[PDB]
Write an enzyme that holds these catalytic residues in place. Sequence first.
Site, short mmCIF file in Angstrom:
data_model
loop_
_atom_site.label_atom_id
_atom_site.label_comp_id
_atom_site.label_asym_id
_atom_site.label_seq_id
_atom_site.Cartn_x
_atom_site.Cartn_y
_atom_site.Cartn_z
N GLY A 74 0.63 -1.28 0.05
CA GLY A 74 -0.01 0.06 0.00
C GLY A 74 0.80 1.33 0.04
N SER B 175 1.97 -7.62 -0.71
CA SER B 175 1.40 -8.74 -0.92
C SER B 175 1.73 -9.61 -1.90
CB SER B 175 -0.32 -8.32 -1.85
OG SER B 175 0.10 -8.01 -3.00
N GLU B 176 2.97 -9.46 -2.16
CA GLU B 176 3.68 -10.53 -3.25
C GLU B 176 4.95 -11.05 -2.61
OE1 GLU B 176 2.97 -9.20 -7.53
OE2 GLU B 176 3.47 -7.36 -6.66
#
Lengths: 206, 206, 206, 206
Positions: free
Chosen positions: B44, B72-73
Amino acid sequence: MERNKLARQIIDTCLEMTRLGLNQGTAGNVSVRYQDGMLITPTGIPYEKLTESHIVFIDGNGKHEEGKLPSSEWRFHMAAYQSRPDANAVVHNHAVHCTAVSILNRSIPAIHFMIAAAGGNSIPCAPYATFGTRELSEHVALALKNRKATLLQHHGLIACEVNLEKALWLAHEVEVLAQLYLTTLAITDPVPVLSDEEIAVVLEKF
Amino acid sequence: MERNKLARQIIDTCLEMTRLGLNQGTAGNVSVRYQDGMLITPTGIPYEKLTESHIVFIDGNGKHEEGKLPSSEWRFHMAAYQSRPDANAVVHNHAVHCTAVSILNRSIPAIHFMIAAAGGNSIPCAPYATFGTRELSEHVALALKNRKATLLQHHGLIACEVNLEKALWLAHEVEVLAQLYLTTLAITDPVPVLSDEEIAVVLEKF
Amino acid sequence: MERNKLARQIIDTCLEMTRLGLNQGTAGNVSVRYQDGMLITPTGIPYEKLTESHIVFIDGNGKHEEGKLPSSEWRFHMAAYQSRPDANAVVHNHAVHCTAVSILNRSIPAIHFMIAAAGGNSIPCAPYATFGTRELSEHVALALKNRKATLLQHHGLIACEVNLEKALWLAHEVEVLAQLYLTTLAITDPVPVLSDEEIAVVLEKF
Amino acid sequence: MERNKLARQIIDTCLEMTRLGLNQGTAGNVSVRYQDGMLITPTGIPYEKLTESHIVFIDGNGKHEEGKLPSSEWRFHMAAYQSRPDANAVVHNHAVHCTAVSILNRSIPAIHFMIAAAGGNSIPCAPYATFGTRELSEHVALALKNRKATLLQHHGLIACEVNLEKALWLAHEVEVLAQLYLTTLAITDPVPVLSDEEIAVVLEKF
Ligand SMILES: [Zn+2]
Ligand SMILES: [Zn+2]
Ligand SMILES: [Zn+2]
Ligand SMILES: [Zn+2]
């Protein structure tokens, strides 16, 4: 949440759009939801000569402030706000890749999973109508019913979001998807896409 | 070789990636090998609001620090480290030319002798799988077995190297090779390539 | 006309090449004619970490200074100087449009009258040979016999001129001609050209 | 409305053209209407070494100031002023997209409604003639009779307007239209256009 801060942000968004290569010349217009209407950039004035006092308030009836001339495309900003209650900021520009796709009159299909940022499996392309008219406004309000961004045939792009920062971010992401689309369309047509099933998973994850 | 220096470098690499035109919006993520796991950018937060304290430590078991949300990866960063013991830094981005090649689902063949920087005569393209999943991680670990960079179908690029400076350099070189490939593919298909024999000589020389 | 000034200029030319988009990563090398040989950039060191003391002197016999490693492509700089006595500076880079044309193995024909800046009605493309070899040097010396710039198949560009400022200027002009050529070749093949008679007039006027 | 202010503006326009990516190397020339003739940039001098004293006055008879060498393309600036009395500034450059369209020898048709900024439904392309000649001047004066900008076959662009700010703005807009045209022509030929009836409405609105 007062006018001078919001005007400052509008101006900063204009400058940043130009920084990013999304806006050339006097083409873009940016607005934010405010009181019963909106604050929008004025018509004519170059981005770099823009001061806080230049920002124009247009009420919910379409009456604009005394002594100022709002962007000539203010009607589709007001249509966006009325069509999407959750939208609090609108960015419009004539970014080159988006606009080239709008000339072909094609929607951008799901060639990359980031297409889900605009709400579905595509970026639509609303039919042409003269800038500043009621007819244009209606196409835009229909295109944004289930999407946060839309191409405008022979014209450019409109993106809306919860605040200016996110609206600019989305607009930049759509210009990248447009560039991906044109670059691959020159090589192969049609371009490989992700299935609806795969986009459905990505949408849940976002 | 302490955390605040390595976090500083991660941030500088993010900023430089954006400078080079390899990263737009919030798309990239960068990590370095550290203790039993890694230091990675958070999910984010925009690159320019990134401070040292924002960098996240994830141990070798996949447990991340208290109060922070890792990229998120992060799973394919951990897969890269486990697949390539010599890798100490990983750069991931959605650079436009690399990503356009990934949409076509093509490997980049030896159209220029700098393709040898990634270890062989090609830049592979790993099959699509939803971001953040175990399935994606497995494709990535298999693609990096004998290559330092790989394209990811409908997604982007991963490059790994001995330190951040070299990992960024490789990532930039692959984006140039991708651009060379797309530009020549629009004119002629297939594109002339150097033979395996010639790439073998260049690899020895490097 | 002393070493520290000439080294300063070499470094400034490297930086400016990067500014102009002609050089990415560590790809370029720049040299100037000096005493019995030349001053050239070193191998490996990133452009922005380059100091005056990093510049390497290579004599006319090919012996380089103690403690320094010259560019790995120094041999074709020395071939340029021996082939063209009037050349006092050489710029080499892997500019993307020039390099894409070199992959197609095409000469750039007279699609614009500025092609006359390199001496004739074309920009040749010398055949491939491994970087750093004698075979490569020979192709380059033959290509520069009647031209001030040449493409190198599957590799990049070499431009030479009376001083660094003019050599950079020529290199930038050839990258523009390459970009013009690729952009029009995607639309039509072959691309319209100016006749030899018209190029002859432009050459006299220059 | 004195010479040093107008020279200052000419220089600023040169610098800004380079900023915008419309001018590379020494290719552009800019002029303003002044007294009985014009003030124009000199031949040869790089834009960044330009000082107020470098600007050249050429009278209405074509006699230029003592000790200065005007741009080698001054004749078509004087032809523009004589052909269009309302023009007070002329910008000429070799912008890459405009120039690529000029190589194809095509006019830019109405693929976007901003084409009306130049006065009609197209941007013409004047036939080739050697730079600096009377023959070139005549083609330019004929092309500008009913248009504010024109492409020049195998050469570049000329735009004229009421002041420098507007002339630069127009020149930048034509480079965007050229880029839109080339990008869509690679995909489909011919490119969709707006009808004459629709351009007629846009022209009235402007
Ligand atoms: Zn618009
Ligand atoms: Zn990703
Ligand atoms: Zn090289
Ligand atoms: Zn010219």
